[PDB]
Each structure stands twice: as C-alpha cells, then as structure tokens.
Structure 1
Amino acid sequence: QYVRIKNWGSGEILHDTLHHKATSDFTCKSKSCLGSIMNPKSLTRGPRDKPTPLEELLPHAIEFINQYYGSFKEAKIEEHLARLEAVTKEIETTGTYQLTLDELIFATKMAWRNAPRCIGRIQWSNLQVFDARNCSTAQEMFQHICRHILYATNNGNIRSAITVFPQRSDGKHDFRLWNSQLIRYAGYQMPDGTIRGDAATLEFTQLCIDLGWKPRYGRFDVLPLVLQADGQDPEVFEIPPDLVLEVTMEHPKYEWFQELGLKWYALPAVANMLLEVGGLEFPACPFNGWYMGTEIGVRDFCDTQRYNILEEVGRRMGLETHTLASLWKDRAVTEINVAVLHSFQKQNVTIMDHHTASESFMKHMQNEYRARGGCPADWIWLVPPVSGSITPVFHQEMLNYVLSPFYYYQIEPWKTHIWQN
C-alpha cells in the first residue's frame, strides 16, 4: 500500500505511495544495498544502434501523454483523446514521434522534479526551455549553447534553463556534448609531476588537446565545448570569454585570502546527461540552475582530488595543521565557505548557502507528499558535504526510486564513439 517514512528531527511521518510508479529495477540487490555507488547502471541510459522497438515505445508514449494531460487543473479530454490518436498514428507512420513544445517543457520540469540527487527541486517549475530539436550541425549547437550560457548567466542574476537538441533516432546519429559541464576548468599534468588546475578534468583535458585545443596551462583555464552533432565526430569550440562570468574569492576578514588568487565560474551546468521521456531519449540537453556554496567551497576547493587547498588555508590561519584532533580542517573549511558566499554576494552573483538549501528542500519534499505522496530522494546526495546533522535533511528518511521523465547519466561518449577520421 505505502512505505512509512519518518523525520527523526520532527517526529513527522509521511506515507510514500509514489514509489509504485517506479520504473524497472533500481541499484540495490535483494540481499545487498549499494546506495553509495556514484554511477550505478540504474541511473545510466546507454547508446543504441537501432530505433526503439515499437512495442516498448507506444506504451511509454501513451503513458507520458496521459501524465501530461492529467497535469492540467481543468481537463481537456478531447484534446487528450486527439493527442493520443495523433501520437499513435505518428508512431505508426514514422516509427517514432515528436513532442509538442508544451509537452517538452512539461517533460523537462518533471524530469528535474524527479531527480533524486537534486536539492534545489523546490524551483522545479521555474525553468526556461530552449528548443533546439531543429539543430543539425556542430556550429548550430555552439550557437545554441552560447545563447543558453548568456541567458542563464544574466550578468550574475542566474536563471535556470535547459536546451534540448534532436532526440536520438537510431542511436547512430546522436547529438552529444563531451563535456561534464558547460563551463569547467582544465586540469594539466605538469612536467614536475604536479597537477595544475582541476585534476578532475585531466583525461577530458588531454582529449581536448588530442583534438587540437591549445592548452594555456593555467590554474583556471575554461575548457572548450566539444560538440557532436547528428552522430558525427566531435568538433572543438572555445567559449567566448565575455560569456563566462567568474567570481574572485575574497574573505570578509582575512585580506590574505585573495592572495590565494582563487575564483570560480558562476554558472553550474550539467552537459552530458540524457533526458528520457515517453519512450523518447534526448542524449543532449545541457541544463543549469545556480550554485550551492558547499559545491565550490567544500568539494571543488577542498576535495583532495580537486584544488585541494585546505592545508594552505589552515597555515594562513595559523592552525595546528599537524594535529587532526585540533579540528583545524573544520576551522578552515568554514572560512573558505564564508569566503565563497561572501565573494558571490559582493559580486552580485546568485548563490545559496547549504543551510538555506536544506530547509528549502524540506519544504519541497513536504509539498511533494501532499501533491503526489512521494519524492524520490537520494539521502547520500541531498545531505550537504559539511554540517550534516546541522541540516534538517539529515534527519529525514528517504526513498530513492527512478520515475519518468528522468535525467540519466550516459557512457562517456569517447568510449563508444565510432570515429570516422
């Protein structure tokens, strides 16, 4: 009937029934739980080489159409009925179908709404949609992407948006962005064995170089867009610097913080995910929202596998960086977090601290259960990387399941791509 969920901080109880609409199997076994696996197959939608079998499509298509028309406050049965037939006939005549712009907008917001790992979902209905399903070349992709970046950046007053390119037809003509995020920094393997820049993009950086991109060997060099159109080999494109807004890091008290010469891009945009909707798959649909402080101040700056700046900030604070039990790491990471938030605020760039985001998510989840008795949520991703139990999200039991529409991961394109030259 329903799974009981409790919030140990408040004692509140919730009944989850939405999980019944869950698609096929998830990650965890029957006698084993994964949960903490970053890229499980349950969240990945791979490549094809043949259209989607009609027996599978039509059911999903009908299903989606029913969900779409069901969403209206005042039903439109004829329109619904009409759409149902038109869709069917279209599938019979073309072996696939096209969504109406409104259905697409609906699909993008719902898929966002269904992202178990997104803590900013209270904003789900507030999303701008750029329809690029007519795109056909790498150059056109590049223009669309630039328009997106410009619209979304909005001189610091960030706006959430998504650009949808042509849906996968037969899997042999996929539109794909080879980047992780639209704007990412390069990571170089220096001569003296050290790593410069974002160690996380090392392989992809090399790939950009192996494709003719000129490495500037900086600590913060914006990587180029590596676009793939209609299944063809990817083409490299530098992002016009005017479009990339950055925030210089300053601490509100430690004047020496700037001496660290740190900065970060203001636009967080996922570039390589696939949008699944009504039997259709969109291998290219870069989207963006805005940053939550800890992503930058904690992960990007303090992960040892990233810019790893924690110890240095410790020393400059004159802490016992050689005695773990002194909790210096705890002292440092906080100042860095304050730096990030301070810097974004002073430069008028949208950002949200993790405490506020958590409360926001709790209100959202709360609304979701009333609205549809459920909210797919991955505790492991929703709980901020610092101050865990200090946030309300930590005390909330959650159910993680994959609905549809959905945003899946994809096999790295360079691992399955059939090159031409």
Structure 2
Amino acid sequence: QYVRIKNWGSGEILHDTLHHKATSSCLGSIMNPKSLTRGPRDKPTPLEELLPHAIEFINQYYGSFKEAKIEEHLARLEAVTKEIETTGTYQLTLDELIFATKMAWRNAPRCIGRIQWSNLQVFDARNCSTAQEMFQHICRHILYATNNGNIRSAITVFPQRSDGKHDFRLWNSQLIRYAGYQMPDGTIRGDAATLEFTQLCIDLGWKPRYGRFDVLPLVLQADGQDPEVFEIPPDLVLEVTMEHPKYEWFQELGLKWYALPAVANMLLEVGGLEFPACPFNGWYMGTEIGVRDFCDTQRYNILEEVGRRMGLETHTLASLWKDRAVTEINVAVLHSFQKQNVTIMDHHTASESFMKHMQNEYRARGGCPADWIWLVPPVSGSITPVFHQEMLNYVLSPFYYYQIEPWKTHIWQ
C-alpha cells in the first residue's frame, strides 16, 4: 500500500502510492526508518539467533588485538557458548563492553564526530537496579562529561535487556533538554519539540515553571517498573549565555543553551545483546544550536527577530536576509562558547575532520558507513568537503539504534 511521508517543519503527512509505478522507492531521507529501530520485547532473544551473533562479536573483539591471543579467544568462545546454554544470555567482560561502545560509535552513520571514536569514557552501571541508582549514575555522567566546560565524551551502560519485560529506559530524548509549554494565550513557550514530553512530566507530577529555558526532569525507568521523575541538580547543568562579538543587542535576546549534547534514548546492540539504556555524549557542533535549535521554525524560530534587529529586508526573500541572519547567529554561538571556555567545533573544521577520519577508516578496515544526508551541515553545504564525498550508508554491529517512545509501549501494571 501507501508509504507514509512526513514534513517535520509543518508536521504534515502524505501518502505515497505513485512509487508503485516505479520501473524497479528510496527511503533515504526518512528520519526514523524501521531498519534503524529496535523495538521492545516480550520474551528473551531466541537462543538460535543470539548464539551466532555472540560468536561473531567475540571474533570481532579478538580480531582487534594487534598481537593475537588465540587461546583466550577460543576459551572465551567456549565460555560464551556454554554460558548462553546454561543461562540463556551472557555477560560481556568490561573490556568487551568498552570495545563495543566505541565500535558502535565508530559504526554510527549519522555522526560527523567519529574521528574521536577511540576516546570515550565508559561508566559500567550494569549492576544498577533502581531508578534512584540510575539518577545517581546519570548525575555522575553529567558531572564527568561537563568537566567545567572542557567537555569529555562518555557513555553510561545500564543493565542489558533480558526478557524485554524488565528493561532500563530513560524516557528523555537527551539528558539535558528544555521544556515546551503551550501557553494559555495560544502561544508556545520554550522548546516546541519537547511539548509532548513536557506534558508527560507535568502529568507525572513535575512542576511547570513556564519559562523559555527550563531544564526538564530526568524520567527514569528501571527493571521495567513505572518511571520515576528526578529534577536535575542545577549545579550540574552548565549553560552558555548568547552574545555576538559585535551587535551588543544580541545579548538582549536573552538566549542561552546547555553545553552538554547527550543522547539519552538510543539502544546499544552488541553480539546479540541489547542495552535499552545507555546515554552518551560528545561535544557540540555549532550548527546544531545556531542553525537547528535556534532557527528551525519548529524549535526556537529566532530568525525573523534577528533579521529584523540586523535591519535586513525581512519581507523579501530574494534579499537573502535569512542567509545573513543565520550566519550571525552561528557566529554568536561559537563566540559565546569560546568566550565562556566551553568546548564546541564549527561546521567546517568538523567536516574536514570527518573527511580525515573517512580516509583513515578506508585504509584501516576498507569502509565507513556514512549517511550523507545527516553528515552534511544544515548550512554551507557545498562549502564543506563532505558534500562532494560519495558515501555508502549501511548498518553494522555493534550499533546504536532508535527505539519506540516508551510511553507508547508501557503499562501501569
């Protein structure tokens, strides 16, 4: 039948039937395809499928060693095979997990920062058991990663999925995100993208401050239990106030953004095992904040105000006012982060670094999964070198997958 297509700017959906007349459709520009998602479960991974995946991963791990260790490799293969037969699953050694988190990052097609793949701090929280313990592990992660502005890449691995009925899940999209409230006067306040989740927190008892930059609480689910809400300690959230190196009126906008880009809802998959809760972070690329968070019409939508304040021909598109504005906003973002000593990289230096990483990957392992659509910056496309680089997008393992929103697949009891 029809293929559902969505416009993220207007939220409109369209149904494609015409593709049926195709000579041989391409789902390339789809944000969340099923091929990139790992849904929930009701019973453990069938032993028949888990086993071969595990063997493959142990072989990958032992193959990494410059100086091979055949005995340990064979021994581990034996132990893993036996463990899966005596328990149903298996536990990774801390070293294997570290390797897995890095390979998964290394295998993320949609990430430009992959040249940093080998530099990741891993926090092993596989022994965690309560929401409260998750919250502490997260506060620890936030604190280590922020590092007073000198951002460090890290990841916290919670307990792996067992029977799918007892998994750990962070209901947040990112560790730190701002609230979005649809004011009584019809207007939207704060981050429009977190409108629904904001209502969820409010439903769960959270206290709405109705500001434009209120950090939402951590909503944590442990051992398949109902989620518990935790306010993030303000002392842990490092923010940057926005100001332009020129244009002293920029600061009058009262804009700021958090310094920690930490993905919180992805699933790690390695050797057949799946970790439903494994928050990670790197540092920001200027355009994420300057172009998308501030300028997306569905986010902060500050373009017109900035253009108007710059005295541009705001009512005539051909004036390229939008181009001029967005660039000044990116300048503000980079300027502020740098002035306040918070790590950030511009979308040129990063593109160039990704290009170096790519050539490195090709000679190291003959390939690099890349999703051109996500890798090319939201501005200056053809100015960056990644735009002119042909790439192949494919899914390997270990890998970070999306997941269905937990509030959609969950029961009170």
TM-score range, shorter chain: over 0.9
Q: Distance in 2 between matches of 1:42 and 1:339?
A: 38
Q: Distance in 2 between matches of 1:109 and 1:23?
A: 41
Change over 3 Å in CA distance of 1:102–1:8 after alignment to 2: same
Q: Distance in 2 between matches of 1:365 and 1:15?
A: 37
Change over 3 Å in CA distance of 1:132–1:212 after alignment to 2: same
Q: CA deviation at 1:276?
A: 0.3
Q: CA deviation at 1:4?
A: 32
Q: Is the 8 A contact 1:158 1:350 kept in 2?
A: yes
User: Looking at both structures, which has the greater relative contact order when contacts are Cα pairs under 8 Å and sequence separation is at least 6?
Assistant: 1
Q: Is the 8 A contact 1:9 1:395 kept in 2?
A: no
Change over 3 Å in CA distance of 1:9–1:225 after alignment to 2: closer
Q: Distance in 1 between matches of 2:80 and 2:292?
A: 45
Q: Distance in 2 between matches of 1:198 and 1:69?
A: 45
Q: Distance in 1 between matches of 2:304 and 2:22?
A: 45
Q: Distance in 2 between matches of 1:281 and 1:125?
A: 21
Q: Is the 8 A contact 1:9 1:396 kept in 2?
A: no
Q: Is the 8 A contact 1:245 1:265 kept in 2?
A: yes
Change over 3 Å in CA distance of 1:373–1:22 after alignment to 2: farther
Q: Distance in 1 between matches of 2:9 and 2:67?
A: 38
Q: CA deviation at 1:163?
A: 0.1
Q: CA deviation at 1:18?
A: 34
Q: CA deviation at 1:389?
A: 0.1
Q: Is the 8 A contact 2:266 2:400 kept in 1?
A: yes
Change over 3 Å in CA distance of 1:178–1:108 after alignment to 2: same
Change over 3 Å in CA distance of 1:11–1:369 after alignment to 2: farther
Q: Distance in 2 between matches of 1:81 and 1:23?
A: 50
Q: CA deviation at 1:14?
A: 37
Q: Any idea what SS the aligned residue of 2:328 has?
A: helix
Match of 1:266 in 2: 259
CA RMSD of aligned residues (A): 7.3
Match of 1:116 in 2: 109
Q: Is the 8 A contact 2:171 2:219 kept in 1?
A: yes
Change over 3 Å in CA distance of 1:14–1:80 after alignment to 2: farther
Q: CA deviation at 1:8?
A: 30
Match of 1:126 in 2: 119
Change over 3 Å in CA distance of 1:250–1:65 after alignment to 2: same
Q: CA deviation at 1:106?
A: 0.2
Q: Is the 8 A contact 2:287 2:346 kept in 1?
A: yes
Once the two structures are superposed, what CA deviation does each residue of 1:104-155 show, in whole Å capped at 9, x if it has no partner? 0000000000000000000000000000000000000000000000000000
Change over 3 Å in CA distance of 1:220–1:203 after alignment to 2: same
Q: Is the 8 A contact 2:9 2:297 kept in 1?
A: no
Match of 1:207 in 2: 200
TM-score by length of 2: 0.94
Q: Is the 8 A contact 2:131 2:222 kept in 1?
A: yes
Once the two structures are superposed, what CA deviation does each residue of 1:323-370 show, in whole Å capped at 9, x if it has no partner? 000000000000000000000000000000000000000000010000
Q: CA deviation at 1:419?
A: 1.6
Q: Any idea what SS the aligned residue of 1:416 has?
A: coil
Q: Any idea what SS the aligned residue of 1:227 has?
A: strand
Q: Is the 8 A contact 1:8 1:396 kept in 2?
A: no
Q: Distance in 1 between matches of 2:166 and 2:265?
A: 16
Change over 3 Å in CA distance of 1:21–1:228 after alignment to 2: farther
Q: Distance in 2 between matches of 1:160 and 1:86?
A: 32
Q: Is the 8 A contact 1:19 1:401 kept in 2?
A: no
Q: Distance in 2 between matches of 1:198 and 1:188?
A: 8
Q: CA deviation at 1:268?
A: 0.2
Q: CA deviation at 1:3?
A: 28
Q: Is the 8 A contact 1:156 1:349 kept in 2?
A: yes
Change over 3 Å in CA distance of 1:311–1:10 after alignment to 2: closer
The total of aligned residue pairs comes to: 413
Q: Distance in 2 between matches of 1:321 and 1:79?
A: 67
Q: Any idea what SS the aligned residue of 1:67 has?
A: helix
Kindly indicate whether residue 141 of structure 2 is the aligned counterpart of residue 148 of structure 1: yes
Change over 3 Å in CA distance of 1:387–1:6 after alignment to 2: farther
Change over 3 Å in CA distance of 1:273–1:303 after alignment to 2: same
Q: Any idea what SS the aligned residue of 1:247 has?
A: strand
Q: Is the 8 A contact 2:170 2:265 kept in 1?
A: yes
Once the two structures are superposed, what CA deviation does each residue of 1:141-197 show, in whole Å capped at 9, x if it has no partner? 000000000000000000000000000000000100000000000000001110000
Q: Distance in 1 between matches of 2:358 and 2:33?
A: 24
Once the two structures are superposed, what CA deviation does each residue of 1:49-70 show, in whole Å capped at 9, x if it has no partner? 1000000001000000000000
Q: CA deviation at 1:38?
A: 0.2
Q: CA deviation at 1:19?
A: 26
Q: Is the 8 A contact 1:46 1:410 kept in 2?
A: yes
Q: CA deviation at 1:17?
A: 34
Match of 2:90 in 1: 97
Change over 3 Å in CA distance of 1:78–1:405 after alignment to 2: same
Q: Distance in 2 between matches of 1:413 and 1:6?
A: 21
Q: CA deviation at 1:13?
A: 39
Unaligned stretches of 5+ in structure 1? 25-31
Q: Any idea what SS the aligned residue of 1:415 has?
A: coil
Change over 3 Å in CA distance of 1:187–1:341 after alignment to 2: same
Q: CA deviation at 1:23?
A: 26
Q: Is the 8 A contact 1:22 1:403 kept in 2?
A: no
Q: CA deviation at 1:7?
A: 30
**Aligned pair partner of 2:248 in 252, 255, 260:** 255
Q: Any idea what SS the aligned residue of 1:361 has?
A: helix
Q: Is the 8 A contact 2:193 2:298 kept in 1?
A: yes
Q: CA deviation at 1:418?
A: 1.6
Q: Is the 8 A contact 2:9 2:298 kept in 1?
A: no
Q: Distance in 2 between matches of 1:19 and 1:132?
A: 47
Q: Distance in 1 between matches of 2:80 and 2:296?
A: 48
Q: Any idea what SS the aligned residue of 1:4 has?
A: strand
Q: CA deviation at 1:34?
A: 1.1
Change over 3 Å in CA distance of 1:330–1:42 after alignment to 2: same
Change over 3 Å in CA distance of 1:83–1:224 after alignment to 2: same
Once the two structures are superposed, what CA deviation does each residue of 1:348-396 show, in whole Å capped at 9, x if it has no partner? 0000000000000000001000001110000000000000000000000
Once the two structures are superposed, what CA deviation does each residue of 1:84-115 show, in whole Å capped at 9, x if it has no partner? 01111111110000000000000000000000
Change over 3 Å in CA distance of 1:50–1:23 after alignment to 2: farther
Change over 3 Å in CA distance of 1:373–1:215 after alignment to 2: same
